[PDB]
Coordinates of C-alpha atoms (C1' of nucleotides) in Angstrom, one line a residue:
Chain A
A1 CA 0.0 0.0 0.0
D2 CA 2.6 2.5 1.2
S3 CA 6.3 2.4 0.4
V4 CA 7.8 4.0 3.6
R5 CA 5.9 1.4 5.4
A6 CA 7.8 -1.3 3.5
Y7 CA 11.2 0.0 4.2
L8 CA 10.5 0.0 7.9
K9 CA 9.2 -3.6 7.9
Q10 CA 12.6 -4.8 6.5
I11 CA 15.0 -2.8 8.6
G12 CA 13.0 -4.0 11.6
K13 CA 14.0 -7.5 10.7
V14 CA 17.7 -7.0 11.4
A15 CA 18.8 -7.6 15.0
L16 CA 20.3 -4.7 16.9
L17 CA 23.9 -5.1 18.2
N18 CA 25.5 -4.8 21.6
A19 CA 28.8 -3.1 22.3
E20 CA 30.8 -6.4 22.0
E21 CA 29.4 -7.3 18.6
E22 CA 30.2 -3.9 17.0
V23 CA 33.9 -4.3 17.8
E24 CA 34.1 -7.8 16.3
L25 CA 32.5 -6.6 13.0
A26 CA 34.7 -3.6 13.1
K27 CA 37.7 -5.9 13.4
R28 CA 36.6 -8.1 10.5
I29 CA 36.1 -5.0 8.3
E30 CA 39.6 -3.6 9.0
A31 CA 41.1 -7.1 8.5
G32 CA 39.2 -7.3 5.2
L33 CA 40.6 -4.0 3.9
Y34 CA 44.2 -4.7 4.9
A35 CA 44.0 -8.3 3.6
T36 CA 42.7 -7.0 0.2
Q37 CA 45.4 -4.3 0.1
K38 CA 48.1 -6.8 1.1
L39 CA 47.3 -9.1 -1.8
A40 CA 47.4 -6.2 -4.2
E41 CA 50.7 -4.8 -2.8
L42 CA 52.4 -8.2 -3.0
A43 CA 51.8 -8.4 -6.7
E44 CA 53.2 -4.9 -7.1
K45 CA 56.3 -5.7 -5.1
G46 CA 56.9 -9.1 -6.7
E47 CA 56.3 -11.1 -3.6
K48 CA 54.6 -14.4 -2.9
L49 CA 53.0 -16.0 0.1
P50 CA 52.2 -19.5 1.5
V51 CA 49.5 -21.1 -0.7
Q52 CA 47.2 -22.0 2.1
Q53 CA 47.7 -18.7 3.9
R54 CA 47.1 -16.7 0.7
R55 CA 43.8 -18.5 0.2
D56 CA 42.9 -17.7 3.8
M57 CA 43.4 -14.0 3.4
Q58 CA 41.1 -14.1 0.3
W59 CA 38.3 -15.4 2.6
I60 CA 39.0 -12.6 5.0
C61 CA 37.6 -10.3 2.4
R62 CA 34.4 -12.2 1.9
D63 CA 34.0 -12.2 5.7
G64 CA 35.0 -8.5 5.8
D65 CA 32.3 -7.4 3.4
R66 CA 29.7 -9.5 5.2
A67 CA 30.8 -7.6 8.3
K68 CA 30.4 -4.3 6.5
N69 CA 26.9 -5.1 5.2
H70 CA 25.9 -6.6 8.6
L71 CA 27.0 -3.5 10.5
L72 CA 25.0 -1.2 8.3
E73 CA 21.8 -3.3 8.3
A74 CA 21.8 -3.2 12.1
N75 CA 22.0 0.6 12.6
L76 CA 19.4 1.4 9.8
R77 CA 17.0 2.2 12.6
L78 CA 19.3 4.9 13.9
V79 CA 19.2 6.6 10.5
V80 CA 15.4 6.7 10.6
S81 CA 15.2 7.9 14.2
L82 CA 17.4 10.9 13.0
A83 CA 15.5 11.4 9.8
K84 CA 12.1 11.9 11.4
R85 CA 13.1 15.4 12.7
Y86 CA 13.9 16.9 9.3
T87 CA 10.6 16.2 7.6
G88 CA 8.5 18.9 6.0
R89 CA 11.6 21.1 5.5
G90 CA 11.4 20.7 1.7
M91 CA 12.7 17.1 1.4
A92 CA 10.8 13.9 1.2
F93 CA 11.1 11.6 4.2
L94 CA 12.7 8.8 2.2
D95 CA 15.3 11.1 0.6
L96 CA 16.3 12.2 4.1
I97 CA 16.6 8.5 5.1
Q98 CA 18.7 7.5 2.0
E99 CA 21.0 10.5 2.6
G100 CA 21.2 9.4 6.2
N101 CA 22.2 5.9 5.1
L102 CA 24.9 7.5 2.9
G103 CA 26.2 9.2 6.1
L104 CA 25.8 5.9 8.0
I105 CA 28.0 4.2 5.4
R106 CA 30.8 6.7 6.0
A107 CA 30.6 6.3 9.8
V108 CA 31.2 2.6 9.3
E109 CA 34.2 3.4 7.1
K110 CA 35.7 5.7 9.8
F111 CA 34.5 4.1 13.0
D112 CA 37.2 3.1 15.5
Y113 CA 36.6 0.2 17.8
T114 CA 39.8 0.9 19.8
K115 CA 38.3 4.1 21.3
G116 CA 35.7 2.0 23.1
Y117 CA 32.8 4.3 22.4
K118 CA 29.4 2.9 21.5
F119 CA 28.9 3.0 17.8
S120 CA 25.7 5.1 17.9
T121 CA 27.8 7.9 19.5
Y122 CA 30.0 8.4 16.5
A123 CA 27.4 7.4 13.8
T124 CA 25.0 10.1 14.9
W125 CA 27.5 12.8 13.8
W126 CA 27.9 11.5 10.3
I127 CA 24.2 10.6 9.8
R128 CA 23.2 14.0 11.2
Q129 CA 25.7 15.9 9.0
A130 CA 24.7 13.7 5.9
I131 CA 21.1 14.9 6.2
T132 CA 21.7 18.6 6.8
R133 CA 24.4 18.7 4.1
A134 CA 21.9 17.1 1.8
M135 CA 19.2 19.7 2.4
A136 CA 21.6 22.5 1.6
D137 CA 22.4 20.7 -1.7
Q138 CA 18.9 19.6 -2.8
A139 CA 16.0 21.3 -0.9
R140 CA 16.0 24.4 -3.0
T141 CA 14.9 24.5 -6.7
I142 CA 17.6 27.1 -7.2
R143 CA 20.6 25.5 -5.5
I144 CA 22.7 27.6 -3.1
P145 CA 26.2 26.5 -1.9
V146 CA 26.2 25.2 1.6
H147 CA 28.3 28.2 2.8
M148 CA 25.5 30.5 1.7
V149 CA 22.8 28.2 3.1
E150 CA 25.0 28.4 6.2
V151 CA 24.9 32.2 6.4
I152 CA 21.3 32.5 5.5
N153 CA 20.3 30.2 8.4
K154 CA 22.7 32.2 10.7
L155 CA 21.0 35.4 9.7
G156 CA 17.5 34.0 10.3
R157 CA 18.8 32.9 13.7
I158 CA 20.1 36.4 14.6
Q159 CA 16.8 37.8 13.2
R160 CA 14.7 35.5 15.3
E161 CA 16.9 36.2 18.4
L162 CA 17.0 40.0 17.7
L163 CA 13.2 39.7 17.1
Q164 CA 12.7 38.2 20.6
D165 CA 14.9 40.8 22.3
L166 CA 13.7 44.0 20.8
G167 CA 10.1 43.1 20.3
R168 CA 10.3 44.4 16.7
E169 CA 11.8 43.1 13.5
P170 CA 15.4 44.2 13.5
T171 CA 16.3 46.6 10.7
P172 CA 19.1 46.0 8.3
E173 CA 21.4 48.1 10.4
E174 CA 20.6 46.2 13.6
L175 CA 20.8 42.9 11.8
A176 CA 24.1 43.8 10.1
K177 CA 25.7 45.0 13.3
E178 CA 24.9 41.9 15.3
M179 CA 26.1 39.8 12.3
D180 CA 29.3 41.9 11.7
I181 CA 28.5 42.4 8.0
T182 CA 27.4 45.3 5.8
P183 CA 23.7 46.2 5.8
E184 CA 23.8 45.9 2.0
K185 CA 25.2 42.4 2.4
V186 CA 22.2 41.2 4.5
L187 CA 20.0 42.8 1.8
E188 CA 21.8 40.9 -0.9
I189 CA 21.5 37.8 1.3
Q190 CA 17.8 38.4 1.9
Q191 CA 17.3 38.4 -1.9
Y192 CA 19.1 35.0 -2.2
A193 CA 16.9 33.4 0.5
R194 CA 13.6 33.9 -1.5
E195 CA 12.3 30.7 -3.1
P196 CA 10.4 30.5 -6.4
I197 CA 6.6 30.3 -6.9
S198 CA 4.7 27.7 -8.9
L199 CA 3.5 28.8 -12.4
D200 CA 1.1 25.9 -12.3
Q201 CA -0.6 27.6 -9.4
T202 CA -4.1 29.0 -9.8
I203 CA -4.2 32.8 -9.2
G204 CA -7.5 33.2 -11.1
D205 CA -10.7 32.5 -9.2
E206 CA -11.9 28.9 -9.2
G207 CA -9.3 27.7 -11.6
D208 CA -10.2 30.2 -14.3
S209 CA -6.6 30.3 -15.4
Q210 CA -3.2 29.3 -14.0
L211 CA -0.5 31.9 -13.1
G212 CA 1.7 31.0 -16.1
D213 CA -1.0 32.2 -18.5
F214 CA -0.3 35.9 -17.6
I215 CA 3.4 35.8 -18.3
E216 CA 4.3 37.9 -21.3
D217 CA 6.9 36.7 -23.9
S218 CA 8.7 40.0 -24.3
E219 CA 11.1 38.4 -26.8
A220 CA 8.2 37.6 -29.2
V221 CA 8.3 39.4 -32.5
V222 CA 6.4 42.7 -32.8
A223 CA 4.5 42.6 -36.2
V224 CA 4.5 46.4 -36.6
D225 CA 8.2 46.6 -35.9
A226 CA 9.2 43.8 -38.3
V227 CA 7.4 45.8 -41.0
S228 CA 8.9 49.2 -40.0
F229 CA 12.3 47.5 -39.8
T230 CA 11.8 46.1 -43.2
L231 CA 10.8 49.5 -44.5
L232 CA 13.9 51.0 -42.9
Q233 CA 16.2 48.5 -44.6
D234 CA 14.5 49.4 -47.9
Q235 CA 14.8 53.2 -47.2
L236 CA 18.5 52.8 -46.3
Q237 CA 19.0 51.0 -49.6
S238 CA 18.0 54.1 -51.5
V239 CA 20.1 56.3 -49.2
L240 CA 23.0 54.0 -50.0
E241 CA 22.4 54.6 -53.7
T242 CA 23.1 58.3 -53.4
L243 CA 26.6 57.6 -52.0
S244 CA 29.6 56.5 -54.0
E245 CA 29.9 52.9 -55.0
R246 CA 33.0 52.5 -52.8
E247 CA 31.6 54.9 -50.3
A248 CA 28.4 52.9 -49.9
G249 CA 30.4 49.7 -49.3
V250 CA 32.5 51.4 -46.6
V251 CA 29.4 52.3 -44.7
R252 CA 28.1 48.7 -45.1
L253 CA 31.3 47.1 -43.8
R254 CA 31.9 49.7 -41.1
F255 CA 28.5 48.8 -39.6
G256 CA 28.2 45.3 -40.9
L257 CA 25.0 45.8 -42.8
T258 CA 26.0 43.3 -45.5
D259 CA 27.6 40.5 -43.5
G260 CA 26.2 41.4 -40.0
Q261 CA 29.6 41.9 -38.4
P262 CA 31.3 45.3 -38.3
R263 CA 34.9 45.8 -39.4
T264 CA 37.6 48.0 -37.9
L265 CA 39.2 50.8 -40.0
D266 CA 42.2 48.5 -40.8
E267 CA 40.0 45.6 -41.9
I268 CA 37.9 48.0 -44.0
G269 CA 41.0 49.5 -45.4
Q270 CA 42.4 46.0 -46.0
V271 CA 39.5 45.1 -48.4
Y272 CA 39.9 48.4 -50.2
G273 CA 43.7 48.2 -49.9
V274 CA 44.4 51.6 -48.3
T275 CA 45.5 52.9 -44.9
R276 CA 43.2 52.6 -41.9
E277 CA 43.4 56.4 -41.6
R278 CA 42.1 56.8 -45.1
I279 CA 39.0 54.8 -44.2
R280 CA 38.5 57.0 -41.2
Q281 CA 38.6 60.1 -43.5
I282 CA 36.3 58.5 -46.0
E283 CA 33.8 57.5 -43.3
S284 CA 33.6 61.0 -41.8
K285 CA 32.7 62.5 -45.2
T286 CA 30.0 59.8 -45.6
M287 CA 28.4 60.9 -42.4
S288 CA 28.5 64.5 -43.4
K289 CA 26.9 63.5 -46.7
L290 CA 24.4 61.5 -44.7
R291 CA 23.5 64.4 -42.4
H292 CA 22.6 66.5 -45.4
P293 CA 18.9 67.5 -45.2
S294 CA 18.0 65.9 -48.6
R295 CA 19.4 62.4 -47.6
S296 CA 18.7 62.6 -43.9
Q297 CA 15.2 64.2 -43.5
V298 CA 13.5 61.0 -44.5
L299 CA 14.9 58.8 -41.8
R300 CA 14.2 60.9 -38.7
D301 CA 10.8 59.2 -38.1
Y302 CA 12.6 55.9 -37.5
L303 CA 14.2 57.2 -34.3
Chain B
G1 CA -8.1 61.5 -15.9
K2 CA -6.3 64.0 -13.8
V3 CA -3.4 63.2 -11.4
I4 CA -4.5 63.7 -7.8
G5 CA -1.6 62.7 -5.6
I6 CA 1.8 61.1 -5.7
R7 CA 3.4 59.0 -2.9
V8 CA 7.2 58.6 -3.2
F9 CA 9.0 56.1 -1.0
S10 CA 12.8 56.4 -1.4
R11 CA 15.9 54.5 -0.1
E12 CA 18.1 57.5 0.7
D13 CA 15.1 58.6 2.7
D14 CA 15.4 55.6 5.0
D15 CA 11.7 54.4 4.8
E16 CA 11.2 50.7 4.7
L17 CA 10.9 48.7 1.4
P18 CA 11.3 45.0 0.6
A19 CA 14.9 43.9 0.2
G20 CA 16.4 45.2 -3.1
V21 CA 13.7 48.0 -3.5
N22 CA 15.3 51.4 -3.7
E23 CA 12.4 53.8 -4.5
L24 CA 8.6 53.2 -4.5
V25 CA 6.2 55.7 -6.0
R26 CA 2.5 55.4 -6.6
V27 CA 0.3 57.8 -8.7
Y28 CA -3.4 58.3 -8.0
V29 CA -5.6 59.3 -11.0
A30 CA -9.2 60.4 -10.6
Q31 CA -12.0 60.5 -13.2
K32 CA -15.3 62.4 -13.3
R33 CA -17.7 59.9 -14.9
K34 CA -20.8 61.4 -16.5
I35 CA -23.7 59.0 -16.7
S36 CA -23.1 57.5 -20.1
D37 CA -25.2 55.3 -22.4
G38 CA -24.3 51.7 -21.6
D39 CA -24.0 52.2 -17.8
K40 CA -26.2 50.0 -15.6
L41 CA -28.9 51.6 -13.5
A42 CA -31.3 49.9 -11.2
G43 CA -33.9 50.5 -8.4
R44 CA -34.3 49.0 -5.0
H45 CA -36.8 46.4 -6.3
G46 CA -34.3 44.4 -8.4
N47 CA -35.2 46.2 -11.6
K48 CA -32.1 46.7 -13.6
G49 CA -31.2 47.8 -17.1
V50 CA -28.6 49.6 -19.2
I51 CA -28.9 53.1 -20.7
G52 CA -30.0 52.5 -24.3
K53 CA -30.1 56.1 -25.3
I54 CA -30.0 59.7 -23.9
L55 CA -32.3 62.1 -25.7
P56 CA -31.7 65.9 -25.5
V57 CA -34.1 67.5 -23.0
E58 CA -36.0 69.0 -25.9
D59 CA -37.4 65.8 -27.5
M60 CA -38.6 64.1 -24.3
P61 CA -42.1 63.4 -23.1
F62 CA -42.9 66.4 -20.9
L63 CA -45.8 67.3 -18.7
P64 CA -48.1 70.3 -19.5
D65 CA -45.7 72.4 -17.4
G66 CA -43.0 71.9 -20.0
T67 CA -41.2 69.9 -17.3
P68 CA -39.4 67.1 -19.2
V69 CA -39.3 63.6 -17.6
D70 CA -35.8 62.3 -16.6
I71 CA -36.1 58.6 -17.6
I72 CA -38.5 56.6 -19.6
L73 CA -39.0 53.0 -18.4
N74 CA -40.9 50.4 -20.4
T75 CA -43.3 48.1 -18.6
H76 CA -40.8 45.4 -17.7
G77 CA -43.2 43.6 -15.3
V78 CA -45.2 41.1 -17.4
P79 CA -48.3 39.7 -15.7
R80 CA -47.6 37.3 -12.9
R81 CA -44.0 38.6 -12.9
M82 CA -45.5 41.8 -11.4
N83 CA -42.7 43.7 -9.6
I84 CA -45.4 45.6 -7.8
Chain C
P1 CA 32.6 28.9 -42.2
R2 CA 32.2 25.6 -40.4
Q3 CA 34.6 23.0 -39.1
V4 CA 33.4 19.4 -38.9
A5 CA 34.9 17.4 -36.0
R6 CA 34.0 13.8 -35.1
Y7 CA 34.2 12.4 -31.6
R8 CA 34.1 8.8 -30.4
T9 CA 32.3 7.6 -27.3
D10 CA 33.3 4.7 -25.1
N11 CA 30.3 2.6 -26.1
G12 CA 31.1 2.9 -29.8
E13 CA 28.8 5.7 -31.0
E14 CA 30.1 8.6 -33.1
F15 CA 29.0 12.2 -33.3
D16 CA 29.6 15.2 -35.7
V17 CA 30.1 18.5 -33.9
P18 CA 30.4 21.5 -36.3
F19 CA 32.7 24.2 -35.1
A20 CA 34.0 27.5 -36.5
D21 CA 36.9 27.3 -38.9
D22 CA 39.1 29.7 -37.0
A23 CA 38.7 28.5 -33.4
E24 CA 40.6 25.7 -31.5
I25 CA 39.1 22.2 -31.6
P26 CA 38.8 20.4 -28.3
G27 CA 40.1 16.9 -27.7
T28 CA 37.1 15.7 -25.6
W29 CA 33.5 16.8 -26.1
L30 CA 30.4 16.2 -24.1
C31 CA 28.2 14.4 -26.6
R32 CA 24.5 13.9 -27.1
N33 CA 25.1 10.4 -25.7
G34 CA 25.8 11.9 -22.3
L35 CA 29.3 10.5 -22.3
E36 CA 32.7 12.0 -23.0
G37 CA 34.1 11.6 -26.5
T38 CA 37.7 11.8 -27.9
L39 CA 38.3 13.3 -31.3
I40 CA 39.6 11.0 -33.9
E41 CA 42.2 13.2 -35.7
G42 CA 44.5 15.9 -34.2
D43 CA 46.0 14.3 -31.2
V44 CA 44.3 14.5 -27.8
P45 CA 46.6 16.1 -25.2
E46 CA 44.1 14.9 -22.6
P47 CA 45.4 16.2 -19.2
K48 CA 43.3 13.9 -17.0
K49 CA 42.7 15.6 -13.6
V50 CA 44.4 12.5 -12.1
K51 CA 42.6 13.1 -8.8
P52 CA 42.3 9.7 -7.0
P53 CA 38.9 9.5 -5.3
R54 CA 39.3 8.9 -1.6
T55 CA 38.6 5.3 -0.8
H56 CA 37.9 3.3 2.4
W57 CA 41.5 2.2 2.5
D58 CA 42.6 5.8 2.7
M59 CA 40.4 6.4 5.7
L60 CA 41.7 3.3 7.5
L61 CA 45.4 3.9 6.8
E62 CA 45.2 7.3 8.3
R63 CA 44.2 5.9 11.7
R64 CA 45.8 2.4 11.8
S65 CA 49.5 2.1 11.3
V66 CA 50.5 -0.8 9.0
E67 CA 51.9 -2.5 12.1
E68 CA 48.6 -2.4 14.0
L69 CA 46.9 -3.8 10.9
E70 CA 49.5 -6.5 10.5
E71 CA 49.0 -7.6 14.2
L72 CA 45.2 -7.7 13.7
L73 CA 45.5 -9.8 10.6
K74 CA 47.7 -12.3 12.6
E75 CA 45.0 -12.5 15.2
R76 CA 42.4 -13.3 12.5
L77 CA 44.7 -15.8 10.8
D78 CA 45.6 -17.4 14.1
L79 CA 41.8 -17.6 14.7
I80 CA 41.0 -19.3 11.4
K81 CA 43.8 -21.7 11.9
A82 CA 42.4 -22.7 15.3
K83 CA 39.0 -23.3 13.8
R84 CA 40.4 -26.1 11.6
Chain D
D1 CA -28.1 18.5 11.9
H2 CA -31.0 20.5 13.3
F3 CA -31.0 24.3 12.5
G4 CA -30.6 25.3 16.2
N5 CA -27.5 23.1 16.3
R6 CA -25.7 25.8 14.5
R7 CA -23.0 27.5 16.7
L8 CA -21.7 30.5 14.7
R9 CA -18.1 31.4 15.4
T10 CA -17.6 35.1 16.0
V11 CA -14.5 37.0 14.8
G12 CA -12.7 36.9 18.1
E13 CA -13.4 33.2 18.7
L14 CA -12.2 31.9 15.3
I15 CA -9.2 34.1 15.7
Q16 CA -8.4 32.4 19.1
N17 CA -8.6 29.0 17.5
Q18 CA -5.9 29.9 15.1
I19 CA -3.8 31.0 18.0
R20 CA -4.3 27.6 19.7
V21 CA -2.6 26.0 16.7
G22 CA 0.2 28.5 17.1
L23 CA 0.7 27.9 20.8
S24 CA 0.3 24.1 20.7
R25 CA 2.8 23.6 17.9
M26 CA 5.1 26.1 19.8
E27 CA 5.1 23.7 22.8
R28 CA 5.9 20.9 20.4
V29 CA 9.1 22.7 19.5
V30 CA 10.0 23.4 23.1
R31 CA 9.6 19.8 24.0
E32 CA 12.2 18.8 21.4
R33 CA 14.5 21.7 22.3
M34 CA 14.8 21.1 26.0
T35 CA 15.8 17.5 25.6
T36 CA 18.8 18.2 23.3
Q37 CA 19.7 21.4 25.1
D38 CA 21.7 21.3 28.3
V39 CA 19.7 21.8 31.5
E40 CA 20.0 25.1 33.3
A41 CA 21.9 26.3 30.2
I42 CA 18.5 27.1 28.5
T43 CA 16.0 29.9 29.2
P44 CA 12.4 30.5 27.9
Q45 CA 13.9 32.8 25.2
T46 CA 16.2 30.0 24.0
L47 CA 13.5 27.3 24.1
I48 CA 10.7 29.5 22.6
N49 CA 10.8 29.9 18.8
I50 CA 7.6 31.9 18.3
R51 CA 7.9 31.7 14.5
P52 CA 5.0 29.3 14.2
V53 CA 2.9 31.6 16.4
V54 CA 3.4 34.9 14.5
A55 CA 3.3 33.0 11.2
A56 CA 0.0 31.5 12.2
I57 CA -1.8 34.8 12.6
Chain E
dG1 C1' 43.7 61.4 -52.7
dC2 C1' 46.5 59.3 -50.0
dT3 C1' 50.2 58.1 -46.2
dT4 C1' 53.3 59.0 -42.2
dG5 C1' 54.4 58.9 -37.1
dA6 C1' 52.7 60.6 -33.2
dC7 C1' 49.5 59.5 -29.5
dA8 C1' 45.8 57.7 -27.2
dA9 C1' 42.1 54.8 -25.9
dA10 C1' 40.5 50.8 -26.2
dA11 C1' 40.8 46.1 -26.5
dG12 C1' 43.0 42.1 -25.3
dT13 C1' 46.4 38.6 -22.7
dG14 C1' 49.1 36.6 -19.1
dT15 C1' 50.1 36.6 -14.1
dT16 C1' 48.1 37.0 -9.2
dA17 C1' 45.3 37.7 -5.3
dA18 C1' 40.5 37.4 -3.4
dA19 C1' 36.3 35.1 -3.2
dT20 C1' 33.6 31.8 -4.1
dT21 C1' 32.6 26.9 -3.9
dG22 C1' 32.7 21.8 -2.7
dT23 C1' 34.0 18.2 0.6
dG24 C1' 35.3 16.3 4.9
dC25 C1' 34.5 16.2 9.8
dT26 C1' 32.8 16.5 14.7
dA27 C1' 33.7 10.0 19.6
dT28 C1' 28.7 9.8 26.5
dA29 C1' 24.9 7.6 24.3
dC30 C1' 21.0 8.0 21.1
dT31 C1' 18.3 2.4 16.9

DNA sequence: GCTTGACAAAAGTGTTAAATTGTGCTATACT
């Protein structure tokens, strides 16, 4: 019927461990890693080992991995008991659990049986950190680096504390002072904290229309402009006719009317085979010719 | 219409605007709406209807005083419907 | 102006990626397949980051000295021998 | 059911009920906070996070 | 109608110093 129900029915099958069992599995795991590394190093160093012993070490690995899997499957309950507290914060319960299990896996990889501390003591750190670190990396549709998620929560903490002391929402100055940062920074920070809204929401009454329907596509073509723009190209064509054959081409290349990419004086002078200063001189005269009332009066309307 | 008032909320002037907002101004425009053909009139008895036309006061059914009538209402209330 | 470069994916699929004639041609290209592809002609100079991802062995070596591990392995082996 | 069985919440009353949700869930936060927090090292200000209260109204 | 050398601004390019960003970690016990 329900999935989260199923996961619990299976982890509940595994038998919890006592302090003594944890160390034994811990030992078997470390023996499994060293045994596996020893076999790999001996081939690198051109060394051999007793046949029977070498085959014994290989089995140490099979027993080591069973220890690793067994250790995890026992403390899965601990992951859930920690994952309950972070529900409703923008992350599905299961996702919290799985991320907790990821943290749990690392704890097993770094746990130390020689310290004599109960396993749950050191695993809670990693499992806890694994979940929190996950939320900062996944809870927001627009991701924010953990350090920024870190400061945002710190600011909200100061805000909530300052809110409780003063009896009024602390201003950017009060909030910046207590946090030892510029008021403009807290403002820039307060902009980052905002989360997006759903276009598929229904702002119209009784589902008359979703919110997305009211969004303009400002990039869409404007029919009247595409026609005026087309008439402007045609009108410039005539204006180009009044200029010199070479003089018209210089204006085209200088602004890129023909190929759509402008050209510097040198490049323009390179196609006409003259100095880059000569092109500068020619262009200036074209503009003067273009500013003449006869040639220029027609194009003012196009602003 | 005409512009009545303007409310300017700046940032230099401390004020208090949502994060990022520098200046906030609102303009209030008023309009004097003459009763125009198409508007919806109605009495207190549920009778309602639009303004189909507005005749000059000259060509309007007027009493012997020369006192023109203001509005001409057809007999909406069919029998049984009443609207007494 | 268009340069036509072909990359080869690990699974065996090939892709054509048009580039500009003037610009440099990369040696590896993120392809439609979703995998990295090496170009066929032009030499690769592929400077692999060569960052070895941290493994469980690295986390164990930094707490157990090889001697402590050797002693543990003897305990385990002396234990398996006894079981026989 | 019957017509007379209608109660009719007044403005002040249905406002109070919304406060109940704010206070009750505020106590649900203080219960969790006091266990993890060190004893005598916490005060009403540290245990009380009125966010669900103000956000409720 | 064109070019020269000056000069400048503007555009790049290589070399460095912040800053930004991602990952690892925290050992009473806690299932």
